Amino acid sequence: STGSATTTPIDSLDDAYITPVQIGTPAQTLNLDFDTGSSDLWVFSSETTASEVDGQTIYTPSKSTTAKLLSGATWSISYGDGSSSSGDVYTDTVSVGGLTVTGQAVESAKKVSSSFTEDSTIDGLLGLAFSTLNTVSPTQQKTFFDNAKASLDSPVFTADLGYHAPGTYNFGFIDTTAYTGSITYTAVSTKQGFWEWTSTGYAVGSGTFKSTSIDGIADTGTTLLYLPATVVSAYWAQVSGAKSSSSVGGYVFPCSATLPSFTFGVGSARIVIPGDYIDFGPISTGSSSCFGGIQSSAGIGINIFGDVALKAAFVVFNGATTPTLGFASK
Ligand SMILES: CNCc1cc([N+](=O)[O-])ccc1Cl
């Protein structure tokens, strides 16, 4: 089996991407944020505290003939941005782009934090990190990918995110028309439950490549690129007037600037992020200070190759017995 679904930016800045997912019988279609940095499939639902729902489409398990309460199971998750959600659990049929899993754990939110409430376009998350991070208690549950894997033609999924445009998540096959050149594969550590790998270095604009190991995670659920302070300082030093603002919460730059590209290494290969991908626009409406798409990971505790980096590549999440990550230019 295979699946193929289009993923669409939620706004003009590519703050996140949503992908339609069919849950239950008859199908209830919810738009979920596919998140390779977490391992819970959770949804706004008929159980979500009413005051915490503002425009989202909800899953109603009582209207699904295939829904079953997973008795006694609860879940609770906190994300790196300080947001959170929690609730109870149903099993139901879940389909993504024509690929169907029966008996998938669908985590029904009873509570969500304010940033979820405020994002009317995101009806929940579909986690694609390793199932060891799943928060369901007392019986940990598997991700959609882990449940699908045995049925897939090949034990892989791919992320092909667009810059200010739709893109694609494929399951079970590599679309050889979706990238240019060859795919470079690199080792993954699953020790922390993430798609964790080591970049071989970086360059700023047309500058020389600095060979240096940068351990980080491939995280489709994080908007920006978070790298060590040394690397980030070297980047923003090339932008006149750029500075780190404690009041804003990161590097800002004059909206009149032309940003340099940023290159990261994957083995002996190189992925180039165009300067425009690093522009996240005015910090507040009408401001001439613009927010940067490359930020320091100091204080996070991990480097994060989020959408700014991933959307510059065709990315293979290889879930074979020894997992690996592949990157190609596109
Ligand atoms: C865990 N990956 C990043 C993240 C993703 C989301 N998401 O809605 O997809 C929310 C918070 C964070 Cl910190």
Domain ranges of the chain: 5-174, 175-330
Report the run of H or E that residue 261 belongs to, with start and end.
none
Report the run of H or E that residue 154 belongs to, with start and end.
none
Q: Which residues are catalytic?
A: 35, 199
How far, in Å, is the centroid of ligand 1 from the Cα of 37? 7
How far, in Å, is the centroid of ligand 1 from the Cα of 78? 9
Give CA 79 to chain center in angstroms. 12
Going 169 to 175 to 180 to 181, the CA torsion angle's sign is: positive
Give the technique used to solve this structure. Answer: X-ray
Buried/exposed 227-263: b ≥16 CB within 10 Å, e otherwise:
bbeebbebbbebbeebebeeeeebbbbeeebebbbbb
**CB-based contact 197:190 (threshold 8 Å):** no
Atom of ligand 1 nearest to the CA of 16: 9
Backbone angles phi, psi at 46, to 5 degrees: -65, -10
Backbone angles phi, psi at 228, to 5 degrees: -60, 150
**CB-based contact 261:268 (threshold 8 Å):** no
Counting ligand 1 atoms within 8 A of each CB, the residue from 38, 39, 115, 126 with the most, and so the one to mutate, is 38
- End-to-end Cα spacing for the chain: 25
Give the DSSP letter of residue 225.
E
Q: List the strands of the sheet with 225-227, edge to edge.
A: 269-273, 262-266, 196-204, 210-218, 303-305, 225-227, 294-296
Residue of the nearest CA to atom 4 in ligand 1? Answer: 221
Give CA 81 to chain center in angstroms. 13
Give the DSSP letter of residue 137.
B
How far, in Å, is the centroid of ligand 1 from the Cα of 117? 14
- Declared resolution, Å: 1.2
* CA distances for 197 relative to 106, 170, 213, 251, angstroms: 29, 21, 10, 25
**What class, spelled out in words, does domain 175-330 have in CATH?**
mainly beta
Close Cβ partners of 157 (under 8 Å, ≥ 6 residues apart): 128, 145, 169, 170, 171, 172, 317, 319
Q: Which of 85, 40, 87, 98 is nearest to 61 (CA)?
A: 87
Backbone angles phi, psi at 251, to 5 degrees: -70, 135
Give CA 252 to chain center in angstroms. 23
Distance CA 191, CA 254 (A): 40
Q: Catalogue the E-assigned strands of 163-224.
A: 167-171, 184-187, 196-204, 210-218
Residue of the nearest CA to atom 11 in ligand 1? Answer: 79
How far, in Å, is the centroid of ligand 1 from the Cα of 81? 7
| Identity at 222, one-letter amino acid code | T
Pocket of ligand 1 (CB under 6 A): 33, 35, 37-38, 79-81, 83, 125, 219, 221-222
H helix and E strand count, the chain? 4, 24
Q: Dihedral (C-alpha) 147, 195, 294, 114: value to the nearest 10 degrees?
A: 40
Counting ligand 1 atoms within 8 A of each CB, the residue from 35, 121, 308 with the most, and so the one to mutate, is 35
5-174: CATH superfamily: Acid Proteases (2.40.70.10)
Close Cβ partners of 274 (under 8 Å, ≥ 6 residues apart): 163, 261, 312
